[PDB]
Coordinates of C-alpha atoms and ligand atoms in Angstrom, one line a residue:
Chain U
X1 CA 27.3 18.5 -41.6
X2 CA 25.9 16.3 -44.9
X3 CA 22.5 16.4 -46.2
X4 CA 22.2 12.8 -47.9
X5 CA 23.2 9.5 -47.4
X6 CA 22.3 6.2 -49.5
X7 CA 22.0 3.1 -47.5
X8 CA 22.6 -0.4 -48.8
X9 CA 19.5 -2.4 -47.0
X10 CA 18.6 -5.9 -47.9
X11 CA 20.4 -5.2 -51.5
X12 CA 18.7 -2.0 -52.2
X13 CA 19.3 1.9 -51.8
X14 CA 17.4 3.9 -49.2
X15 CA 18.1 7.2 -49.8
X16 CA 17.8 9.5 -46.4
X17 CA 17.5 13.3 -47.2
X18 CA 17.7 16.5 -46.1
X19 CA 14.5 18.9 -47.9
X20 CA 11.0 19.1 -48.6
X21 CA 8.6 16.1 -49.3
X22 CA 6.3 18.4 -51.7
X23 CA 9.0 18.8 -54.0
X24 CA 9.9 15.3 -54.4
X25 CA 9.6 13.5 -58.2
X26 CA 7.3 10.6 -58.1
X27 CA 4.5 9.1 -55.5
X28 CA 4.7 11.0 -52.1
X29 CA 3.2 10.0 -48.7
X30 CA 0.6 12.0 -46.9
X31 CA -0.2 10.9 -43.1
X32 CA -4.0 11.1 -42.9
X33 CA -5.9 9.9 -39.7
X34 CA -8.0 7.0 -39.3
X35 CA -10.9 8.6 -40.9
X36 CA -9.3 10.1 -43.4
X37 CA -10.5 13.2 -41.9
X38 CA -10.1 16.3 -44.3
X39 CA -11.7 19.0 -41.7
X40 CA -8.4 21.3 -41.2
X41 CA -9.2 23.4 -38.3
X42 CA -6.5 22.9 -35.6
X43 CA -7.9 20.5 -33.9
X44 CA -9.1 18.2 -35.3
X45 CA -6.1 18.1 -38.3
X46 CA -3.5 20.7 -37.8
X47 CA -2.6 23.7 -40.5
X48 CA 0.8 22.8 -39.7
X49 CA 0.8 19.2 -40.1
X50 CA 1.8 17.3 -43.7
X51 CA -1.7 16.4 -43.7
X52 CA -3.4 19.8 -43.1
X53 CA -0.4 21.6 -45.1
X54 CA -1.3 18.9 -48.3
X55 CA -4.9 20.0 -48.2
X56 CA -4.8 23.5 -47.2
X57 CA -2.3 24.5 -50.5
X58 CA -0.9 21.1 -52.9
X59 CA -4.3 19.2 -52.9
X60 CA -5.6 19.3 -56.7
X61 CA -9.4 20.2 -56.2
X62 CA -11.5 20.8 -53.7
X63 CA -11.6 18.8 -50.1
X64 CA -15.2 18.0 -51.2
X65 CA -14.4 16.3 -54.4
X66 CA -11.5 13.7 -52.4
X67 CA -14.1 13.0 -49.6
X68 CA -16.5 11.9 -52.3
X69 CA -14.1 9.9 -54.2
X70 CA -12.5 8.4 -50.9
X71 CA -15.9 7.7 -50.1
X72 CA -16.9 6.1 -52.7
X73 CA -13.7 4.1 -53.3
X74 CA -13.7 -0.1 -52.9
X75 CA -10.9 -1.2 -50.2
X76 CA -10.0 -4.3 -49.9
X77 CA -12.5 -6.1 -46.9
X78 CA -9.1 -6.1 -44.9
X79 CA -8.9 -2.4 -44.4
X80 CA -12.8 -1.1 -43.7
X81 CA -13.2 -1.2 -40.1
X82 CA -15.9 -0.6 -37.6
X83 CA -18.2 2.5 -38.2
X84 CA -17.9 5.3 -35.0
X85 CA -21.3 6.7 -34.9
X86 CA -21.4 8.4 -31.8
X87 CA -18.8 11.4 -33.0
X88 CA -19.3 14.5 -32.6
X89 CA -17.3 15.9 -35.5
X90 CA -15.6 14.2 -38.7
X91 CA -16.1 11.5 -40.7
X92 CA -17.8 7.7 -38.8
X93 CA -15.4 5.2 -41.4
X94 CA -12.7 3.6 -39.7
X95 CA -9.7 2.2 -41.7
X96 CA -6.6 -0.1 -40.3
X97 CA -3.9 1.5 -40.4
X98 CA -1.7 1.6 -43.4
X99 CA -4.6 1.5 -45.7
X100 CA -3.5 3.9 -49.0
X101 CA -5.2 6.4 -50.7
X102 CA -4.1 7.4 -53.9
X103 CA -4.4 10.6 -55.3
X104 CA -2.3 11.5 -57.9
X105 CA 0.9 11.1 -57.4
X106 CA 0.2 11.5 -53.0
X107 CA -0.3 8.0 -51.4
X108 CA -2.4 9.3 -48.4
X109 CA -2.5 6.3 -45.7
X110 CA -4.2 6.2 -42.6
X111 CA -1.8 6.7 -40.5
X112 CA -2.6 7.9 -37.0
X113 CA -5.6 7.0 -34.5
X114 CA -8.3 10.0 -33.2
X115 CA -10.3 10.7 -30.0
X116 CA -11.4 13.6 -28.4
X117 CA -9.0 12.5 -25.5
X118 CA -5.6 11.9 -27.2
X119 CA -6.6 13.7 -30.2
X120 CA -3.9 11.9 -32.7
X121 CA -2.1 9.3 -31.1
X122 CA -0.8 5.6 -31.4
X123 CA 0.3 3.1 -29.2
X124 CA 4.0 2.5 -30.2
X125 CA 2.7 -1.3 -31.3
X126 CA 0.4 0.3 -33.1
X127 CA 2.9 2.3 -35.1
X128 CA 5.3 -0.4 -35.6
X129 CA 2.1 -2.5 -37.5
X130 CA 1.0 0.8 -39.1
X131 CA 4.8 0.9 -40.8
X132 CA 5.0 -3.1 -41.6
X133 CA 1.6 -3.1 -43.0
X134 CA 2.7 0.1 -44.7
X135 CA 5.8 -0.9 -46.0
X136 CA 4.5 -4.5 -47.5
X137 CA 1.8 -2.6 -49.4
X138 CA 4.7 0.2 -51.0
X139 CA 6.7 -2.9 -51.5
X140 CA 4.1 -5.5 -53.3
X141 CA 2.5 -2.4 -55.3
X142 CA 5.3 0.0 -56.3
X143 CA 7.6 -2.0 -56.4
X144 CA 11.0 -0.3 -58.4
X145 CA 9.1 2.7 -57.9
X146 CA 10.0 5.9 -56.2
X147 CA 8.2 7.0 -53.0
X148 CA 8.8 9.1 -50.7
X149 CA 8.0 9.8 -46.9
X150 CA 8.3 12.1 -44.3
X151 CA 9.4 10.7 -41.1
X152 CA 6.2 9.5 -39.5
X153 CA 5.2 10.5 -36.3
X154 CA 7.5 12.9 -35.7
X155 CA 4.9 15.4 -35.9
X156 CA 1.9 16.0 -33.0
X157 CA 1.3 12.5 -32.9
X158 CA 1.5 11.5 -29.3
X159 CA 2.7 8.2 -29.3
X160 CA 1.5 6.5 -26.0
X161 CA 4.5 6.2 -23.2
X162 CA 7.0 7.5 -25.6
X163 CA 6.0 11.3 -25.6
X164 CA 9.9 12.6 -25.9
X165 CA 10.9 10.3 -28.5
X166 CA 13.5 11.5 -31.0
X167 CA 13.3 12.2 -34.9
X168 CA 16.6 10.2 -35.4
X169 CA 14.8 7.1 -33.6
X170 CA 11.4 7.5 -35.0
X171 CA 13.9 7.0 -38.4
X172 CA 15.4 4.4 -37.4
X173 CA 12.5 2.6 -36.6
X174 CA 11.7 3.4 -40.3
X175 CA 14.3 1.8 -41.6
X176 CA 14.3 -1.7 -39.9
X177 CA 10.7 -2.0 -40.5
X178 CA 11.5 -1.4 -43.7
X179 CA 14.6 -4.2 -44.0
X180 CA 12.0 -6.6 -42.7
X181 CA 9.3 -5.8 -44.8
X182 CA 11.8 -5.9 -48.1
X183 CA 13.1 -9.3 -46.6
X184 CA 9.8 -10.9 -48.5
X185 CA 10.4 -8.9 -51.7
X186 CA 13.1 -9.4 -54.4
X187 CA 12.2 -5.8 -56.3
X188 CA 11.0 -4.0 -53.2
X189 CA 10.1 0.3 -53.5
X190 CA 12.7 2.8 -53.9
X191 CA 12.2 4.8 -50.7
X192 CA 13.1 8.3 -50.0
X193 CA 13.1 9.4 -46.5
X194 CA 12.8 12.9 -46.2
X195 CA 14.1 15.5 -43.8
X196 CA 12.6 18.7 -43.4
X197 CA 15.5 20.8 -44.7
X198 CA 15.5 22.7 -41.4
X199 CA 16.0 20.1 -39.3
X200 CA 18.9 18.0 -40.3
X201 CA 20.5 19.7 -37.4
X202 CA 18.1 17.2 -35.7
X203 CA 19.7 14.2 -37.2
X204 CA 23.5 12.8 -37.7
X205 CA 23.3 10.9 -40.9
X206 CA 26.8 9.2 -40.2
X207 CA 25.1 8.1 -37.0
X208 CA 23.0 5.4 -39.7
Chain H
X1 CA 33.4 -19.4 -31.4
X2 CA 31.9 -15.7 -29.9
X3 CA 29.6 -17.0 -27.1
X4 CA 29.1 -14.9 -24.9
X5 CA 28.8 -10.8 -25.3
X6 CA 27.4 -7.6 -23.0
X7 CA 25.7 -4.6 -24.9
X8 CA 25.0 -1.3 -23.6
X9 CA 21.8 -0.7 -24.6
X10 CA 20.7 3.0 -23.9
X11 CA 22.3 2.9 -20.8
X12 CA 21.2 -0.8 -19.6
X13 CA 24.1 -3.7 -20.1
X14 CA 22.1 -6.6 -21.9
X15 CA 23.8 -10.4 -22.5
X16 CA 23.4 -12.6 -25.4
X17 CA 24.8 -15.5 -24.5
X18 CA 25.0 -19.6 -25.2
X19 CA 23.2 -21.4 -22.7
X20 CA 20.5 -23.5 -21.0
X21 CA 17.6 -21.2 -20.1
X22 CA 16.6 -23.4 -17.3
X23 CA 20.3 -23.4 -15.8
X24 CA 19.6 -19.2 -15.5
X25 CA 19.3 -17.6 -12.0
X26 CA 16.7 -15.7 -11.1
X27 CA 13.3 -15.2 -14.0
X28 CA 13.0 -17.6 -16.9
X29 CA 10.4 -16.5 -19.3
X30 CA 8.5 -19.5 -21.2
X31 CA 6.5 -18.8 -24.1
X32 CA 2.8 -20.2 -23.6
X33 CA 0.4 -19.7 -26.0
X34 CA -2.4 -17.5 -26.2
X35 CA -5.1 -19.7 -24.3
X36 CA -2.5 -20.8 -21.9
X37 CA -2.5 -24.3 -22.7
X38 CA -0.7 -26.8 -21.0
X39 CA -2.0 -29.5 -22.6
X40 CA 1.5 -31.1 -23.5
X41 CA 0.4 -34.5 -26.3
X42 CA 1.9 -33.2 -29.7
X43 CA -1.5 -31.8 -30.7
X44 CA -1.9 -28.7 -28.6
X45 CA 1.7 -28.1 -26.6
X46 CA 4.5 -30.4 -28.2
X47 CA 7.1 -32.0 -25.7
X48 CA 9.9 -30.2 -27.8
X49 CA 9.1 -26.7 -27.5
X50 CA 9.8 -24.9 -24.2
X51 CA 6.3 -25.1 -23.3
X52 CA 6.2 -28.5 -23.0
X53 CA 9.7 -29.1 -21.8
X54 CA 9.0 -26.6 -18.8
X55 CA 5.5 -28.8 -18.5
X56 CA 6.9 -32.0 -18.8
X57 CA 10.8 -31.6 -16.8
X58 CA 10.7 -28.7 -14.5
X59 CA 6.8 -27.5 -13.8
X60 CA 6.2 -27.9 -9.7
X61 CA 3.2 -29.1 -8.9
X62 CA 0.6 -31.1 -11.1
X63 CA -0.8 -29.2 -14.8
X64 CA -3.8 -29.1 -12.7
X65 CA -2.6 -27.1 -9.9
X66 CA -1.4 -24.6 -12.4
X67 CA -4.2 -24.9 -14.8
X68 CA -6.1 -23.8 -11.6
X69 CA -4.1 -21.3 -10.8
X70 CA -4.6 -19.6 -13.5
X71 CA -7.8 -19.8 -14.2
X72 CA -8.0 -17.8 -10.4
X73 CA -5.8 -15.5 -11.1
X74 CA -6.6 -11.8 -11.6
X75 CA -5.5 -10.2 -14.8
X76 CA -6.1 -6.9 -16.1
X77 CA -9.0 -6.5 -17.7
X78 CA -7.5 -5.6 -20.9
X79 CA -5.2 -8.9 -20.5
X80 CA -8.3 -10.5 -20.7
X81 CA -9.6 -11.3 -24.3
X82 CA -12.8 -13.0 -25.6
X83 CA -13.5 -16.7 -25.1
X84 CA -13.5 -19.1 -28.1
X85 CA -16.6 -21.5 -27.2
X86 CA -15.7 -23.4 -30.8
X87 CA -12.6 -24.3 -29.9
X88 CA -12.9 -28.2 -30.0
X89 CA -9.7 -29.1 -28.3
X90 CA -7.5 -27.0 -25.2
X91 CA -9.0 -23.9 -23.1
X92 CA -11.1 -21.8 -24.6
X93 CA -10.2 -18.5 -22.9
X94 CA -8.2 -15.9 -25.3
X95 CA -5.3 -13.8 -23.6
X96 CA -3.6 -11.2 -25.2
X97 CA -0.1 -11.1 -26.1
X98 CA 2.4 -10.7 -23.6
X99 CA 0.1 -11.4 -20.9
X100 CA 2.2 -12.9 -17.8
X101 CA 1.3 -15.7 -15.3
X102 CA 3.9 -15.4 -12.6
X103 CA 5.3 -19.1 -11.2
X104 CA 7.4 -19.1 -8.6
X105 CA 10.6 -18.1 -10.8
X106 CA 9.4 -18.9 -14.1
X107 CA 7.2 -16.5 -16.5
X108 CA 4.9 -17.6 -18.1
X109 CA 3.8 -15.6 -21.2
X110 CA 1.1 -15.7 -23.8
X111 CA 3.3 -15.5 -27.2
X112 CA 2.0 -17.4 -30.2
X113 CA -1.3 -17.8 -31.9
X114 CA -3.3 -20.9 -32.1
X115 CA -5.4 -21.4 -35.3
X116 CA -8.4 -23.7 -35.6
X117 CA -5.5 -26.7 -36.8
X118 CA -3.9 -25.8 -33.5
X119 CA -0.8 -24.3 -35.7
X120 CA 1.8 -21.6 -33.5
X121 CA 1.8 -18.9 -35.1
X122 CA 1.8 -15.0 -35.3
X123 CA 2.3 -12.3 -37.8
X124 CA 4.5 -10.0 -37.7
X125 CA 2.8 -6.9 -36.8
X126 CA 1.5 -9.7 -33.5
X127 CA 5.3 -10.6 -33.0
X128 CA 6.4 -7.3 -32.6
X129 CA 3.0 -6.4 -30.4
X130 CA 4.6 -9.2 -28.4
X131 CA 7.7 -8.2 -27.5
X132 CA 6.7 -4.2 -27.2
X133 CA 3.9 -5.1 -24.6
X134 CA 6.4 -7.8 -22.7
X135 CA 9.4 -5.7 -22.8
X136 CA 6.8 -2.9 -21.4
X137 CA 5.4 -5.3 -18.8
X138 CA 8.7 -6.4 -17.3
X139 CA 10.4 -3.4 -17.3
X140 CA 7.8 -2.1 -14.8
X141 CA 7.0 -5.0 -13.0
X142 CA 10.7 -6.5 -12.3
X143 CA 12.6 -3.1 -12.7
X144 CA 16.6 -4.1 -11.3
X145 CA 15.4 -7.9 -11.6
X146 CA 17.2 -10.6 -13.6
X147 CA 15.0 -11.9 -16.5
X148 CA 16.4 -14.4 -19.0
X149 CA 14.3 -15.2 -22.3
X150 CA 15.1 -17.7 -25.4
X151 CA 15.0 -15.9 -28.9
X152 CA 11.4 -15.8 -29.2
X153 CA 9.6 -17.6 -32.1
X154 CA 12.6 -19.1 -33.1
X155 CA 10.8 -22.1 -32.7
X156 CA 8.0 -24.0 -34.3
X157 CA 6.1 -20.7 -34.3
X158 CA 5.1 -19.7 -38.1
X159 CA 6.1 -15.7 -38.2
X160 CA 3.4 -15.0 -41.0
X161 CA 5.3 -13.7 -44.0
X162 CA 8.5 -14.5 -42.8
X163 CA 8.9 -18.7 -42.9
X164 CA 12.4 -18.3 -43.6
X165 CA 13.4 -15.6 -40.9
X166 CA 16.3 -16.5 -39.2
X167 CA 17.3 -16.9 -35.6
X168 CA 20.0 -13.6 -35.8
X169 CA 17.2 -11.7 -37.3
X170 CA 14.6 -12.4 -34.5
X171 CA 17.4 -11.7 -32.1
X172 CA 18.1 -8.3 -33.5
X173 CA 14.4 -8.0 -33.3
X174 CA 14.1 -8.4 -29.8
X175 CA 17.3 -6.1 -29.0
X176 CA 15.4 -3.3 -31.3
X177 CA 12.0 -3.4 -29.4
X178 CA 13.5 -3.9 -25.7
X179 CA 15.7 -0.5 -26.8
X180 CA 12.6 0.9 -27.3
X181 CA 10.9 -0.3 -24.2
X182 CA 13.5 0.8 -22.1
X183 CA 13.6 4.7 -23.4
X184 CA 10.7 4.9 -21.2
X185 CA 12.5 3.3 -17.6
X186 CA 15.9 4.4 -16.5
X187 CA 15.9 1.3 -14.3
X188 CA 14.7 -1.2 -17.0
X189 CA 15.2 -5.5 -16.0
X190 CA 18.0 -6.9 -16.2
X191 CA 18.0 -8.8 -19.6
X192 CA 19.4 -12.1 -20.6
X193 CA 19.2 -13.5 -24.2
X194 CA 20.3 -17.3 -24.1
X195 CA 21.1 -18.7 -27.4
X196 CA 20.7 -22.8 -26.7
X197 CA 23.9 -23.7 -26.7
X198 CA 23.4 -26.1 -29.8
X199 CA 22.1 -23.0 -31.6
X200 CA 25.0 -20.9 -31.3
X201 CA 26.1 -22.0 -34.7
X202 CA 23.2 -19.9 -36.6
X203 CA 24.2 -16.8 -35.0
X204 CA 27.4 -14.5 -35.0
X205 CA 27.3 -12.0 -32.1
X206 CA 29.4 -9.6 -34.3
X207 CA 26.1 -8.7 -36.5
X208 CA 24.1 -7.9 -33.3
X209 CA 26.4 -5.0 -31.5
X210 CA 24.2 -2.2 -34.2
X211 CA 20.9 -3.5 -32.9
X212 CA 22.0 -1.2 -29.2
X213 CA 22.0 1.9 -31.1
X214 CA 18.4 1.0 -32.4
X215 CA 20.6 0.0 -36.1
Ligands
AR6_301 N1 7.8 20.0 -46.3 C1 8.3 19.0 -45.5 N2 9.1 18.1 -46.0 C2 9.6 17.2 -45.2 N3 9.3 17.0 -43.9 C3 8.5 17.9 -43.4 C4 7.9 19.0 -44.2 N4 7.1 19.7 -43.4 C5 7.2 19.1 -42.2 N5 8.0 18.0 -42.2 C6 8.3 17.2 -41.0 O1 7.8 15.9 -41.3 C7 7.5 15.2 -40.1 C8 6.1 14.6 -40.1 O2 5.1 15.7 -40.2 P1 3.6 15.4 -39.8 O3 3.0 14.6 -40.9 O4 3.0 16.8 -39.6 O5 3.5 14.7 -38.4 P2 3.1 13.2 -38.1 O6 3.8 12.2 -38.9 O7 3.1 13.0 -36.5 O8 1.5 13.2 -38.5 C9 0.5 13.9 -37.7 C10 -0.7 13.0 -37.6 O9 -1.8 13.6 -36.9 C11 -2.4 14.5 -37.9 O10 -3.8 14.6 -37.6 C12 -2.3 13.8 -39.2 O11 -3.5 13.4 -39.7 C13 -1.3 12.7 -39.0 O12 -2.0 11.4 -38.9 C14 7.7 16.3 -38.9 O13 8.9 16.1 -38.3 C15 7.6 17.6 -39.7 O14 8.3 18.6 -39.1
AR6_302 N1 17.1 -25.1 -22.8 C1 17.0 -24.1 -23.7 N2 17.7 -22.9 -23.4 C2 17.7 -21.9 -24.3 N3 17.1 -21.9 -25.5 C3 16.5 -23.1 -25.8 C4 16.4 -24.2 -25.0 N4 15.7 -25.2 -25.6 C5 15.3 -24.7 -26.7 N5 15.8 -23.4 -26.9 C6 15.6 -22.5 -28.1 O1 14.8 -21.4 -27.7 C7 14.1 -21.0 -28.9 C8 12.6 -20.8 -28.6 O2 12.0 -22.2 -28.4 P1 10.5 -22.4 -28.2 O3 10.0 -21.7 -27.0 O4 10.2 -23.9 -28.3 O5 9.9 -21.7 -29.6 P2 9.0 -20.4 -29.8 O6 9.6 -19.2 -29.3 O7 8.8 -20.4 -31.3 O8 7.7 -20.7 -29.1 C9 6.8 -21.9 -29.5 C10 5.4 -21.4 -29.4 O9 4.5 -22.5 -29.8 C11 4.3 -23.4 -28.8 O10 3.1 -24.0 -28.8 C12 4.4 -22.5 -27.5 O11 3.1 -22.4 -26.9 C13 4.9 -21.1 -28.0 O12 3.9 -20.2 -28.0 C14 14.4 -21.9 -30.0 O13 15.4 -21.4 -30.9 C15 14.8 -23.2 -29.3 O14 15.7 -24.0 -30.1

C-alpha cells in the first residue's frame, strides 16, 4: 500500500514511482514507433497512448514542425535503417530501435515496430535489445542526469508470444536490463520509473 | 561449499548444480557457432571449448558424417541465414541464433558469432536473442524432457561490452530469460544448469534464488 521505493542497483538509486510521467522534473521518455510516426488517428498511433497523448496536448509546436526537424536531423549511421516504400500510410524511414529523439526536455525513442498486421508489436528479443540499446545510450549521454520512463510496453504493444504479460514483469525486465547496462558505466543516469498513479494497485513495490 | 540447489521458477523446478555436462542423462546442449563449424585445430573450434571437446571425446561418427548431416538437414526457413562466400576459412553458411541440430542426445546449437579473425563472440542484445529464441525452441520441442546446458558464454566467447562479466551474472541471465520463456508453456523442459565442477568456486548459489522471481 506504498507509492515509492528507491532501489540500490549496481551502486546507484532507481527510484520506482507511483504518478504521472508528464509531470516529472527533468528529460522524460516518449515511446514513438519505428518511424517516428506522428499521425494520431487510432490506428496507426493511439489518442490514448504516451505517444499519441505527448503529441495530441504536451508537444511544444506543431506535429509539422517535429517531423521536419526529425527529418532533417543527422543520426548516427548505426541507427537509419532501410527505407519502407511500399506503405500505404505514414512515414518510409526506418530507425533501430532505441534510437533518441530529443525534443526539449522529452527523449522520444523508437520504440515499437509497425505493420498493418500486428500494428505495434515486438518480438520479446526485440524488446530486450530495444531496452539495452536504450539504456547504454541514457547511460553514456545523461549520465548523473535525471530521466524518467514509463514502463515500456505495457501499453497496446503486442509483444509476440507473450500477449498477457504483466506490468510488474515488463518492470522488472526494466530493471535488470538496466543493472546490466550500468555494469559498463561508473556515473550511469538517474532513472525514474514511473507508475501511472492509478495503477499501483497493479504492482507490489515490496515485491522488488 | 553450496553445490547443488532446485528453484521454482514460475511453477517449473530448475537445478543449478556442479557437474560434468557430459556425465548428464538425457539432452546435453553444446554451443556451436553460427556456421556450425566443426572444424576443431585452434583456429576455427578450439579443443578446449565444449565444441571441440564434444568433437574431439564424445561426437559418434566421423566430423564428416555430421558435417553431412547437417548440411541435409531441413531447417526453418527463417533458421536459415545468408551465406558468407568471403569467408576464407570454415563453412560458409550463416545460421541464426539458437538454431538446433538434433544428435542423438546431444544439441547442438548455433550460439556465438564468428568475425572475419575467426573471434567467438556476441553482443549483448545477440546473447540475450540467444537464450530467448533457445529457451523458446526447447520449451516446445522437448516439453517434460530433460535438458542440461553449461552457463552459456562463460567461455572464450567475447560478450561485446561486457569483457569482464562474470560467470554468476550470465547465470542469472539465463534464469531471467528461461522465466520469461516459460510464461508462455505450462509444461516447459526440464532444465539443468551445470556449473563445471572446477567452476563452482566463482559462483555462490545464494545470489541466484531472486533470479526465479524474474529479480
Ligand atoms: N501519465 C502517465 N504517467 C505514467 N504512466 C502512464 C501515464 N499514462 C499512461 N501510462 C502508462 O504507461 C505505460 C506505457 O504507456 P504507452 O506508451 O501508451 O504504451 P507502450 O509502452 O506499449 O507504447 C505503445 C507503443 O505503440 C504506440 O504506437 C506507440 O508509438 C508506442 O511505440 C502504460 O501502462 C500506460 O497505462
Ligand atoms: N564438462 C563440462 N561440464 C560443464 N561445464 C563445463 C564443462 N567443460 C567446460 N564447462 C564450462 O562451461 C562453460 C561454457 O563453456 P564453452 O561452451 O567452452 O564456452 P561458451 O559458452 O563461451 O561457448 C564458446 C563459443 O565459442 C566456441 O567457438 C563455440 O563454438 C561457442 O560458440 C564454461 O564456463 C566452461 O568452463
Amino acid at each position: 500500500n506504498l507509492s515509492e521505493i528507491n532501489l540500490d542497483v549496481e551502486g546507484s538509486i532507481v527510484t520506482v514511482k507511483a504518478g504521472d510521467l508528464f509531470r516529472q522534473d527533468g528529460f522524460k521518455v516518449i515511446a514513438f514507433n519505428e518511424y517516428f510516426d506522428t499521425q494520431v488517428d487510432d490506428v496507426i498511433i493511439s489518442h490514448n497512448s504516451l505517444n499519441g497523448l505527448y503529441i495530441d496536448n504536451y508537444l511544444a509546436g506543431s506535429v509539422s514542425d517535429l517531423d521536419h526537424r526529425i527529418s532533417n536531423h543527422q543520426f548516427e549511421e548505426d541507427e537509419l535503417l532501410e527505407v519502407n516504400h511500399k506503405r500505404k500510410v505514414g512515414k518510409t524511414q526506418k530507425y533501430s530501435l532505441g534510437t533518441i529523439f530529443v525534443n526539449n526536455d522529452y527523449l522520444l525513442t523508437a520504440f515499437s515496430k509497425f505493420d498493418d498486421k500486428n500494428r505495434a508489436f515486438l518480438t520479446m528479443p526485440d524488446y530486450l535489445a530495444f531496452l539495452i540499446n536504450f539504456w547504454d545510450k541514457v547511460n553514456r549521454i545523461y549520465a548523473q542526469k535525471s530521466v524518467s520512463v514509463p514502463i515500456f510496453g505495457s501499453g497496446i504493444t503486442r509483444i509476440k508470444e507473450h500477449k498477457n504479460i504483466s506490468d510488474e514483469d515488463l518492470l522488472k525486465i526494466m530493471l535488470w536490463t538496466f543493472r546490466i547496462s550500468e555494469m559498463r558505466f561508473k556515473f550511469p543516469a538517474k532513472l525514474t520509473i514511473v507508475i501511472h498513479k492509478d495503477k499501483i494497485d497493479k504492482i507490489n513495490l515490496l515485491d522488488i
